[PDB]
């Protein structure tokens, strides 16, 4: 379903998978919240994938 994993090459970026029909906006909202709560050394970015990649 929804997955979250570190970016292979970008320590400051994570990868998020959002399956079809899922509320992307709600997923983003969470990411923006937690993205700032902690945060890496650099700027916190996420890559959003459309569809279940499992």
């Amino acid at each position: 379903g929804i997955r979250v994993m570190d970016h292979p090459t970008m320590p400051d970026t994570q990868v998020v998978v959002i399956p079809k029909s899922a509320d992307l906006q709600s997923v983003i909202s969470v990411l923006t919240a937690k993205g700032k709560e902690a945060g890496p050394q650099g700027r916190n970015k996420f890559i959003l994938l459309s569809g279940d990649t499992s």
Binding site: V16, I28, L31, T32, G35, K36, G39, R43, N44, K45, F46, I47, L48, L49, S50
Partner: peptide, 25 residues
Amino acid sequence: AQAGAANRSLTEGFVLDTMNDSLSK
């Protein structure tokens, strides 16, 4: 992200900037 321009967007998926709370398409 596609190289060859300043506007290095993705060819697939989106980039979420959680520092400026803005989604780049």
